Amino acid sequence: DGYFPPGTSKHELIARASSLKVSEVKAIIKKQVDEHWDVIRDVCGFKNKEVAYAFFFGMATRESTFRAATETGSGASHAFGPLQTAETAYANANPNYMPEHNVPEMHQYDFTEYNFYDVGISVHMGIRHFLHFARLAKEKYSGRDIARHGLMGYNTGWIDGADESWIVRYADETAALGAWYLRNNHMSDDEFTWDTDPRVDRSNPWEIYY
Ligand SMILES: OC[C@H]1O[C@@H](O[C@H]2[C@H](O)[C@@H](O)[C@H](O[C@H]3[C@H](O)[C@@H](O)[C@H](O)O[C@@H]3CO)O[C@@H]2CO)[C@H](O)[C@@H](O)[C@@H]1O
Numbered sequence: 386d387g388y389f390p391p392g393t394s395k396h397e398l399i400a401r402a403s404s405l406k407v408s409e410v411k412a413i414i415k416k417q418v419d420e421h422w423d424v425i426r427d428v429c430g431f432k433n434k435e436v437a438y439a440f441f442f443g444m445a446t447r448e449s450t451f452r453a454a455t456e457t458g459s460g461a462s463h464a465f466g467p468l469q470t471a472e473t474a475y476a477n478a479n480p481n482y483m484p485e486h487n488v489p490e491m492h493q494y495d496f497t498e499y500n501f502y503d504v505g506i507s508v509h510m511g512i513r514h515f516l517h518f519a520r521l522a523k524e525k526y527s528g529r530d531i532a533r534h535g536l537m538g539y540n541t542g543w544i545d546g547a548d549e550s551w552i553v554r555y556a557d558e559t560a561a562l563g564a565w566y567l568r569n570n571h572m573s574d575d576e577f578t579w580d581t582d583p584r585v586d587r588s589n590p591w592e593i594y595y
């Protein structure tokens with residue numbers, strides 16, 4: 386899963402992530418989706434691998450505008466990478482973090498400088514962390530609501546309870562942003578869209594995925 390050489394310093398992991406091309410970040414994402422397709426499909430029910438790639442590109446867009454060195458938050462919300470993978474994804478990160486032992490299909494990397502700041506491990510962990518919440522959402526939700534509430538869980542820690550302004554501004558936005566890539570032939574190039582871009586079709590933003 387690791388992208389850069391093990392032993393690479395924190396400073397260089399960050400600088401080498403800020404200089405990754407959009408196309409290279411897409412390629413990292415697709416390789417994790419390819420590696421973990423079966424658990425992604427079992428949890429989320431996505432139609433196919435292409436639409437699952439697009440969903441994750443939606444996430445990278447909403448979370449980092451595809452800037453792989455983006456770093457935000459503090460403690461449990463402290464996040465890095467294209468998908469803004471929070472510390473709570475990682476094993477042994479802090480004892481006050483709620484456990485994520487419900488994705489046995491994907492290795493839970495320990496919290497270490499390399500595993501947090503390496504773009505490859507960050508992306509793998511972001512997908513595992515999202516499937517931790519999406520599998521919780523599956524207990525009560527079906528269809529597009531597994532991913533919509535999965536996202537609420539990814540961003541907030543809770544699948545339920547957010548204000549409905551945010552399920553639209555954050556989870557529906559993610560679905561609409563990912564579909565732009567699929568509809569406009571941006572699945573492998575350096576082109577990206579962004580939160581609120583008025584070009585993006587926000588109508589029925591989940592239907593493409595199922
Ligand atoms: O709160 C959800 C996630 O937000 C991430 O920040 C994103 C902003 O929410 C989003 O508004 C901003 O979109 C900008 C874009 O960055 C800029 O290039 C474009 O010109 O304008 C857009 C609209 O203002 O994108 C950022 C991500 O780059 C946080 O990074 C993430 O931690 C948080 O979970």
Ligand SMILES: OC[C@H]1O[C@@H](O[C@H]2[C@H](O)[C@@H](O)[C@H](O[C@H]3[C@H](O)[C@@H](O)[C@H](O)O[C@@H]3CO)O[C@@H]2CO)[C@H](O)[C@@H](O)[C@@H]1O
Binds near residue numbers: 539541
């Ligand atoms: O009361 C239950 C336990 O809560 C623990 O805090 C959690 C917060 O309630 C939850 O909001 C936060 O969620 C993170 C999320 O994991 C992350 O992906 C996202 O980027 O940021 C969210 C926060 O904005 O997770 C924390 C930790 O699991 C308390 O630490 C714990 O004592 C308490 O029993």
Ligand code: NI
Binds near residue numbers: 386420421509
């Ligand atoms: Ni992986």
